């Protein structure tokens, strides 16, 4: 699997055991002014996230 | 918890113990033209979905959104 990542220079290749891509979004103190914080990666399973975090999971290449 | 729902006949109120709202999307035969199919609801945990189907989970009231079509 390949997934899009948080930084443009990162390898998109997932570790063997990670077939899900994800996009995690949340707000910080600057959320309304600068935008939502984001993290993109691979995972073995769709991440459980804290309250107030939003998580989008998919399992095709670069689907995030 | 309250969440957006797919059909007009569904109450927004979640069952007790279902604190997650979800947007589940996929493509049918018209996807490239008419965009994704969508289901919106409540759940106790974020639904696990098969390859080809995408799932977005959040845990605030009515947080489950769907962008139909082009920005307007």
From Swiss-Prot, chain B:
It is found in: Secreted. Binds with high affinity to muscular (alpha-1/CHRNA1) and neuronal (alpha-7/CHRNA7) nicotinic acetylcholine receptor (nAChR) and inhibits acetylcholine from binding to the receptor, thereby impairing neuromuscular and neuronal transmission. One of its GO terms (molecular function) is toxin activity. This is Alpha-elapitoxin-Dpp2a. Expressed by the venom gland. Disulfide bonds join 3-21, 14-42, 27-31, 46-57, 58-63. InterPro entries: Snake_3FTx, Snake_toxin-like_sf, Snake_toxin_con_site, Toxin_cobra-type. It comes from the Eukaryota. Transmembrane segments: none annotated. GO terms for cellular component: extracellular region. Keywords: Acetylcholine receptor inhibiting toxin, Disulfide bond, Ion channel impairing toxin, Neurotoxin, Postsynaptic neurotoxin, Secreted, Toxin. It comes from Dendroaspis polylepis polylepis. Belongs to the three-finger toxin family. Long-chain subfamily. Type II alpha-neurotoxin sub-subfamily. Gene3D superfamilies: CD59 (2.10.60.10).
């Amino acid at each position: 699997r390949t997934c899009n990542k948080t930084f443009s220079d990162q390898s998109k290749i997932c570790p063997p055991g990670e077939n899900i891509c994800y996009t995690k979004t949340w707000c910080d103190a600057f959320c309304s002014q600068r935008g939502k914080r984001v993290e993109l990666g691979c995972a073995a399973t769709c991440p459980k996230v804290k309250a107030g975090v939003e998580i989008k999971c998919c399992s095709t290449d670069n689907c995030n």
